[PDB]
Design a protein around this ligand. Structure first.
Ligand SMILES: Nc1ncnc2c1ncn2[C@@H]1O[C@H](COP(=O)(O)OP(=O)(O)O)[C@@H](O)[C@H]1O
Ligand SMILES: Nc1ncnc2c1ncn2[C@@H]1O[C@H](COP(=O)(O)OP(=O)(O)O)[C@@H](O)[C@H]1O
Ligand SMILES: Nc1ncnc2c1ncn2[C@@H]1O[C@H](COP(=O)(O)OP(=O)(O)O)[C@@H](O)[C@H]1O
Ligand SMILES: [Mg+2]
Ligand SMILES: [Mg+2]
Ligand SMILES: [Mg+2]
Lengths: 548, 520, 546
């Protein structure tokens, strides 16, 4: 009476282990545990989304409005929330676009499932309901598609691609940020029209180097690349035309020492006198074959000796440090050189082509530039991103990664296959999925119905973040899809969507003239991985933890 | 089921900070206003300085926005945006750091009551980002395309708010000559490297056409060499001139004892052969990054050849550009043409420290002055004041743009913003006018430190812009307000553009934030 | 704010020393820290709060009167706002939430004037000339309350006091209740001056049906239990006599320090009998008077209960002093502290007894209450509030108690003004034109004083979770034309405010919301006198306890 028996036969397992079954409203608590961090994502989706401060134990801060990025640093206790972390991590790695959406949907499917489990629907039927809804959802995304790119390189078409992507992360001004990406995409692409070759594009080609100071308007698009290096011997503006040559060596510019106990041995004074001059003549003789080929800059892979440096700057050969593997490989793709570890003569076919190598003050430190010209184009271009706050450089840099990741979406499938944005693609599926529930019989119809109700979060979120009342903006938009028999045949009611700024009522003046669209490849895997996030959380009825 | 407790699963870790509510973003603004209060009275020439002592008991005194926030280890996340804006302006410009922080502070402080109202975050950011585009274009019209009259006036204003402002009559005459030695498109900052000399008075400084570096070591034959050469010749070395291992190894087998005497004499033979090649070319001054042994310096000491060592690579690079020579890491490849020359040489006693002076070159790329002072903070303040002024006259050579100082730029931009807000769109009229009066914080505090009443000043500025078209600003000497063009006070426009862009970027960064997560 | 100052550098004080603008900033954050809990409770859109005493007990409260009294603050600058909330509850009885917000913003908006090198003496002078100019403008814009032939000048007054409460939806039912209650308990004093004693009506903490079905008692309801269970509970028939006694009726000892001493043991029993008999002689004459109902402040011993049970008299013990004065005042009896007269004899006259029509004891959820109705000489009233629990009824008790004070003032002073921030927005347009006339440094003080008055209509929109600038800009547009009305009614664009349930600007006279002007007068002076107290402080001297 004074004390319970405190759960007998509990010594089967350790004291730290705990069980969590579906009963006792614990599945409702797991939905509430998702609801804690899901509401943090409500303020972070859309162009009016708000970034988030995340102070780690080390003190490294990252400011961001994306989900996959913010969830990396937060240490999570609930395992069901970690499914959303790895689900968004999969979204960032594969497609690099549409992660707030994964969280927003996989969280609202669990929200509407709170009503379904409370009604009395078995968990097995819930998975069958969303799977049958998923097959119809992915089918209709291919049907209501409009428009296509059909050209890899164009000035006006890239404005339709990059601009709606970076509009979520650090909107700012539209033109100054979009032109930096569309100019850099055209440099790296192998155009090769009327040849029948397979296109190819690498995410690691376009890379952004962060430099403090300046303003966002002063950002330029560099053909080549840049490091924060210092030439050792001398600096040269290189005002001499008639382009220079490039030779890349991965080994250090020094005498190839013996790997096993390299030690001097001098038996008599005759070897003592010649050993000091032998190293000078040997290093000089190797530079003669290198210098006669007309090379004026050599990129070293490791530490360079002083004696080798004395003969390099004699003939005015520039030295560059790249003490890492990937930093040396990215530079060969610009000039198109084939490195060889030997210290002999570079082959003439393997020598690279760089016209000028300038050294100027951008951020107060010494930097080396490798700008090419219109002739003999190169790939793996960089973008000089100027800004005041280092935290803003980090989020804008990842926005270029999201934009570069969107360019990857054009290579693998047959084409662009753009969709209407601004909630139009979500609100259209609500009517189609609702009609699909009426066609199918059985107790799964409520699962099909709640699956459509979960898609309202995109227009509800954009209306809440835009400072508008969602009770008036949402049903005003339903009138465009509740309508029938209106004059025009060629119907233009599909482009109606929400609006962040402007006219009252809100149905946007089309997403058309506005030139904002969404990618099909993002919506396919996002709805697939979001449904898998809700499937794995709803399919499990018992959870076991340890130590907490 | 495995335990009677059944602990409730917390979402985040234990100890994580709080979350959404009322007052989260307001605390970040109040945190910035707190840091902004410390840098508030340091504005203008009639301001003050801030004394800080960190945990390591290192004394420092300064009136700057980058240096004050650098020593202070700011742990608050939203407050480090200011450290960043300051650092950024210093980097790209080196002057007006504080202004940027006070402007950032007032825009966020002015955004405080709008956030208390039902105004969303994106509406406030759209106002500043649309207004700053017109401020940059308006500053281009305020700035002039001046080319006539051929530096002197720009340096006097950059030295304000710190020590050498009153001594501008002597320091500006030689500071203008520092950048004229540098040619176009190079602008090397390491050539303007200046060192510390604890001891002396700042008035006894002088201009030097070359370098002056500390020896940092007393050699055995240092006094034997002459201190005065009429026609010296400089040659830079890199080989180590002493008896030691040759190339990173030491192993010598000897079988016969007769050859054991010869191998030692060979080492003595080659080391003098290494020194004799330096002697035959007539190099009077010898310099090397690596140490120089007692054997070499005594060989040079007999026949009147000065030598020195224990110098850094940054100092060596300044020696080459001053004398116009080159680096030679081998004694056999020495030729007469690569030797640098100057007018004369004289080692002088400076603060109980010896320095090797070079001066009188026909074409010198280097300006390096010795900073002597009483305390270690006096020589430090003279360095930072010159380092901020030298950047202004440096970039003045890059482009010739001049705007009126004394808070005159903020008032002229604010009047057109009030006209632009009066015309259109209704809703953003409050935001742009709020940005207008918030932009006037620079002349606001500039007169409060002077002891004058702000109401009589600010009422005189607004109603007198018609005849004071653009060059209308404050004057501290006559205790009145007049035209700044007659007073010859000038300031470039690059401080103004980077200040508004950095301040607009700073306030818009955390204005798009309504959260704070702190693990552990 | 940044760091702590030096502790008595060459001053030699045992406590702490601070000076400059740092403490002036701490007073602003101190007034804002205590005002944030009052922000969300303002207006009908505000929500309630609960204060936990760390013992399980909690209480729901909306008004900032008792919230700040319960919140034990140690900073003395915040104590003035704590006492200001208690001060405004005593005199006016309404608007405790508004003076804290108004006083805090006047100090907050004046904080910018401090660092402009405007002295506080000049700032308060600019505030005071704005005050007396505002009081005269309030005296021009107000209106008398006979107002119209229909009443509804009292049905609409109750809605303003009843708003922002749990029973604000039921204010249509309770509006008729409060006006019928205070019109019954009026009195006469000072040769024609009518008074309305607040708290004279009995607010009972009942549980049961709902707040909508709360029956208004046409008479006073005494909250006390019956002594014995064998007594008659219901007494019918007209002209029921009410006896109000206060003397000690239980058997008590002799004088406070005397000792009973007797030699003859024969009379030892007789002195015991007369001590038991002398207390029953008082009960004998009350039965001769024929008092059906008798009420006593002190206890009632079993020696007296047998006579009341036999003669069918309703004896009730454990009455309180303040209640029996209202029973005697309502039923027409007079308070009897002891039975005596100018003559030496001891007797009881029938004139001391009251009169009422019916007395019934009712029980509802373990709450026995004696319902006394039908007082002949003067009417009375009581309100039986019904809800979930006692802690929810405490909010209803404070809601009703504040409603009586507001309806008290509109009858004592017929002048009223509309709500919804009308006068707060009208004074801004009046003071802006006056600020330019005075010329010198007081323009900023009068201007910022006007800007601080707009916080009342702004807080209604912020707590509503709607767009605030559009409503304030539209309210600003109509009030801007009121000063430029160009008289020749067609004097429109006045007496308008915010309508939060619909989000439009409509006429407050037709909407049915008003407030007396005297509440605006005392709230402005008490808010400014509190602002004068905080602005004039320069340096703090906190002495630690010994
Ligand atoms: N200016 C705009 N007007 C209307 N809708 C917009 C605008 N900018 C973005 N959107 C919509 O907001 C949505 C936000 O997508 P989001 O998940 O943030 O993309 P990302 O994966 O890059 O984060 C987009 O799908 C787009 O349709
Ligand atoms: N001689 C002068 N007369 C009037 N105003 C000046 C003068 N020199 C500097 N100022 C003002 O002082 C302000 C701050 O400049 P400065 O002291 O150089 O840097 P900081 O912003 O770090 O204090 C500028 O906005 C400028 O208008
Ligand atoms: N129905 C209403 N419509 C508009 N404003 C109202 C309404 N009811 C109250 N108010 C406003 O609320 C303010 C304070 O209300 P009050 O009844 O004192 O709240 P509390 O009872 O919490 O003190 C008044 O100044 C009045 O203008
Ligand atoms: Mg996107
Ligand atoms: Mg300065
Ligand atoms: Mg009230």
């Amino acid at each position: 009476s004074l004390r319970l028996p405190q759960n007998p036969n509990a010594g089967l397992f350790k004291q730290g282990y705990n069980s969590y079954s579906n009963a006792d409203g614990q599945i409702i608590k797991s939905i509430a545990a998702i609801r804690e961090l899901h509401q943090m994502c409500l303020t972070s989706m859309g162009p009016c989304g708000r970034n988030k401060i995340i102070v780690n134990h080390l003190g490294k801060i990252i400011i961001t409005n994306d989900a996959a990025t913010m969830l990396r640093e937060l240490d999570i206790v609930h395992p069901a929330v970690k499914v959303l972390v790895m689900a968004t991590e999969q979204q960032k790695i594969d497609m690099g676009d549409g992660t707030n959406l994964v969280m927003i949907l996989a969280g609202e499917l669990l929200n509407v499932s709170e009503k379904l489990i409370s009604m009395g629907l078995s968990a097995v039927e819930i998975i069958q309901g969303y799977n049958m809804a998923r097959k119809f959802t992915l089918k209709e995304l291919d049907e209501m598609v409009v428009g296509e790119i059909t050209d890899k390189n164009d000035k006006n078409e890239l404005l339709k691609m990059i601009k709606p992507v970076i509009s979520s992360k650090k909107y700012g001004s539209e033109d100054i940020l979009s032109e930096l990406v569309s100019e850099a995409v055209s440099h790296v692409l192998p155009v090769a029209q009327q040849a029948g070759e397979i296109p190819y594009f690498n995410v690691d080609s376009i890379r952004v180097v962060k430099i403090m100071g300046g303003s966002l308007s002063n950002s330029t698009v560099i053909k080549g690349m840049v490091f924060n290096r210092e030439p050792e011997g001398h600096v040269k503006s290189l005002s001499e035309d008639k382009k220079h040559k490039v030779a890349v060596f991965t080994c250090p510019l020094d005498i190839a020492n013996t790997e096993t106990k390299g030690t001097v041995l001098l038996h008599n004074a005759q070897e003592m006198l010649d050993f000091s001059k032998g190293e000078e003549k040997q290093i000089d003789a190797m530079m003669k074959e290198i210098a006669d080929m007309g090379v004026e800059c050599i990129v070293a892979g490791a530490g360079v000796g002083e004696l080798a440096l004395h003969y390099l700057n004699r003939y005015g050969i520039l030295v560059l440090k790249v003490p890492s593997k990937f930093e040396l490989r990215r530079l060969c793709r610009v000039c198109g050189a084939t490195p060889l570890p030997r210290l002999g003569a570079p082959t003439p076919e393997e020598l690279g082509l760089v016209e000028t190598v300038k050294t100027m003050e951008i951020g107060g430190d010494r930097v080396t530039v490798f700008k090419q010209e219109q002739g003999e184009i190169s790939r793996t271009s960089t973008i000089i991103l100027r800004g005041a706050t280092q935290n803003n450089l980090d989020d804008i840099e990842r926005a270029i990664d999201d934009g570069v990741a969107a360019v990857k979406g054009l290579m693998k499938p047959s084409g662009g296959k753009l969709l209407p944005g601004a909630g139009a693609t979500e609100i259209e599926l609500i009517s189609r999925i609702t009609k699909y529930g009426e066609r199918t019989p059985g107790l799964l119809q409520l699962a099909i119905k709640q699956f459509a109700v979960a898609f309202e979060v995109v227009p509800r979120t954009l209306a809440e973040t835009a400072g508008l009342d969602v009770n008036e903006v949402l049903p005003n938009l339903y009138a465009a899809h509740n309508v029938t028999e209106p004059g025009a045949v060629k119907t233009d009611h599909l482009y109606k969507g929400v609006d962040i700024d402007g006219e009252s009522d809100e149905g946007v003046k089309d997403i058309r003239e506005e030139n904002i669209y969404d990618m099909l490849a993002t919506k396919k895997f996002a709805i697939n991985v979001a449904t898998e996030a809700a499937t794995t959380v709803l399919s499990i009825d018992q959870i076991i933890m340890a130590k907490k | 089921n495995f335990g009677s407790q059944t602990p409730t699963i917390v979402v985040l870790k234990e100890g994580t900070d709080a979350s959404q509510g009322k007052g989260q973003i307001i605390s970040n603004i109040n945190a910035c206003v707190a840091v902004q209060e410390a840098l508030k009275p340091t504005l203008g020439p009639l301001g003050s300085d801030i004394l800080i002592v960190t945990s390591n008991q290192k004394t420092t005194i300064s009136n700057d926005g980058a240096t004050i926030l650098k020593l202070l280890d700011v742990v608050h996340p939203a407050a480090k945006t200011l450290v960043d804006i300051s650092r950024a302006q210093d980097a790209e410009v080196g002057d007006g750091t504080t202004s940027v922080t006070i402007l950032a502070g007032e825009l966020m402080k002015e955004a405080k009551p709008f956030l208390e109202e039902g105004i969303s975050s994106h509406l406030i950011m759209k106002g500043y980002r649309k207004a700053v585009s017109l401020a940059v274009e308006k500053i281009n019209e305020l700035a002039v395309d001046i080319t006539s009259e051929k530096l002197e006036r720009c340096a006097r204003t950059a030295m304000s708010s710190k020590l050498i402002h009153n001594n501008a009559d002597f320091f500006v005459k030689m500071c203008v000559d520092a950048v004229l030695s540098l040619d176009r498109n190079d602008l090397d900052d390491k050539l303007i490297g200046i060192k510390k000399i604890p001891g002396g008075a700042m008035e006894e400084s002088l201009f030097i056409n070359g370098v002056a570096f500390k020896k940092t070591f007393s050699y055995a034959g240092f006094e034997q060499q002459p201190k005065k050469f009429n026609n010296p010749k400089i040659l830079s070395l890199n080989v180590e001139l002493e008896l030691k291992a040759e190339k990173d190894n030491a192993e010598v087998r000897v079988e016969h004892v007769e050859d054991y005497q010869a191998i030692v004499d060979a080492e003595w033979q080659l080391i003098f052969e290494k020194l004799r090649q330096v002697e035959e070319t007539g190099a009077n001054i010898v310099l090397s990054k690596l140490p120089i042994g007692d054997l070499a310096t005594q060989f040079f000491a007999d026949r009147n050849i000065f030598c020195a060592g224990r110098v850094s690579a940054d100092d060596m690079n300044r020696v080459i550009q001053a004398v116009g020579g080159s680096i030679q890491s081998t004694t056999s490849d020495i030729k007469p043409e690569h030797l640098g020359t100057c007018a004369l040489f004289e080692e002088m006693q400076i603060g109980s420290e010896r320095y090797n002076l070079f001066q009188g070159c026909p074409q010198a790329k280097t300006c390096t002055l010795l900073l002597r002072g009483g305390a270690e903070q006096v020589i430090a303040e003279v360095e930072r004041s010159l380092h901020d002024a030298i950047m202004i006259v440096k970039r003045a050579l890059q482009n010739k743009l001049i705007v009126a100082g004394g808070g005159a730029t903020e008032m002229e931009v604010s009047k057109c913003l009030r006209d632009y807000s009066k015309t259109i769109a209704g809703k953003q009229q409050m935001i742009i006018n709020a940005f207008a009066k918030a932009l006037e914080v620079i002349p606001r505090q500039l007169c409060e430190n002077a002891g004058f009443d702000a109401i009589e000043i600010l009422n005189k500025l607004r109603l007198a812009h018609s005849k004071g078209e653009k060059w209308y600003g404050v004057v501290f000497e006559t205790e009145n307000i007049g035209d700044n063009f007659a007073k010859f006070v000038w300031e470039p426009a690059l401080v103004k553009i980077n200040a508004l862009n950095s301040a607009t970027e700073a306030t818009n960064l955390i204005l798009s934030v309504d959260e704070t997560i702190t693990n552990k | 704010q940044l760091f702590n100052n030096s502790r008595s550098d060459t001053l030699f004080l045992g406590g702490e020393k601070i000076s400059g603008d740092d403490i002036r900033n701490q007073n602003v954050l101190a007034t804002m820290a205590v005002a944030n809990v009052v922000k969300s409770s303002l207006g009908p859109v505000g929500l309630d709060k609960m204060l936990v005493d760390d013992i399980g007990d909690f209480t729901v409260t909306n008004d900032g009167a008792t919230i700040l009294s319960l919140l034990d603050v140690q900073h003395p600058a915040g104590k003035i706002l704590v006492e200001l909330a208690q001060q405004q509850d005593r005199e006016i009885g309404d608007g405790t939430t508004s003076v804290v917000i108004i006083a805090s913003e006047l100090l907050k908006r004046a904080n910018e004037l401090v660092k402009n090198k405007i002295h506080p003496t000049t700032i308060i002078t600019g505030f005071r000339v704005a005050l007396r100019e505002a009081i005269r403008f309030i005296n021009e814009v107000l209106s008398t309350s006979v107002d119209t032939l229909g009443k509804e000048t009292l049905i609409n007054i109750a809605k303003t006091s009843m708003s922002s409460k749990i029973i604000g939806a039921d204010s249509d039912f309770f509006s008729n209740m409060v006006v019928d209650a205070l019109l019954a308990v009026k009195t006469q004093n000072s040769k024609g001056e009518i008074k309305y004693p607040v708290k004279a009506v009995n607010v009972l903490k009942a549980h049961g049906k709902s707040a909508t079905e709360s029956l208004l008692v046409p008479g006073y309801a005494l909250n006390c239990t019956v002594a014995s269970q064998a007594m008659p509970k219901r007494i019918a028939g007209g002209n029921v006599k009410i006896a109000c006694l206060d003397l000690n009726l239980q058997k008590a000892r002799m004088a406070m320090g005397v000792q009973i001493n007797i030699d003859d043991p024969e009379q030892l029993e007789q002195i015991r009998k007369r001590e038991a008999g002398i207390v029953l002689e008082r009960v004998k004459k009350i039965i001769d008077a024929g008092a059906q109902v008798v009420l006593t402040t002190k206890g009632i011993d079993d020696l007296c209960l047998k006579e009341f049970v036999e003669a069918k008299i309703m004896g009730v013990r454990r009455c309180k002093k303040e209640d029996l004065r209202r029973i005697a005042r309502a039923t027409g009896a007079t308070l009897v502290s002891s039975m005596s007269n100018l003559e030496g004899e001891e007797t009881f006259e029938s004139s001391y007894l009251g009169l009422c029509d019916e007395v019934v004891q009712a029980k509802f959820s373990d709450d026995e209450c004696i319902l006394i109705k039908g007082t002949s000489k003067h009417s009375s009233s009581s309100i039986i509030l019904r809800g979930a629990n006692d802690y929810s009824l405490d909010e209803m008790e404070r809601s009703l108690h504040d409603s009586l004070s507001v309806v008290k003032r509109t009858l004592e002073s017929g002048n009223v003004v509309p709500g919804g921030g009308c006068v707060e927005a009208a004074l801004n347009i009046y003071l802006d034109n006056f600020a330019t006339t005075v010329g010198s440094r007081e323009q900023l003080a009068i201007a910022e004083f006007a800007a601080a008055l707009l916080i009342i209509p702004k807080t209604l929109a912020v707590n509503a979770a709607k767009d605030s600038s559009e409503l304030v800009a539209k309210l600003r547009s109509y009030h801007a034309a009121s000063q430029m009305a160009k008289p020749e009614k067609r004097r429109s664009y006045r007496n308008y405010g915010l309508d939060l349930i619909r989000g439009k600007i409509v006429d407050e006279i037709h909407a049915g919301v008003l407030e007396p002007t005297i509440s605006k007068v005392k709230s402005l002076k008490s808010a400014l006198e509190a602002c004068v107290a905080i602005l004039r402080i320069d340096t703090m001297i906190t002495v630690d306890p010994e």
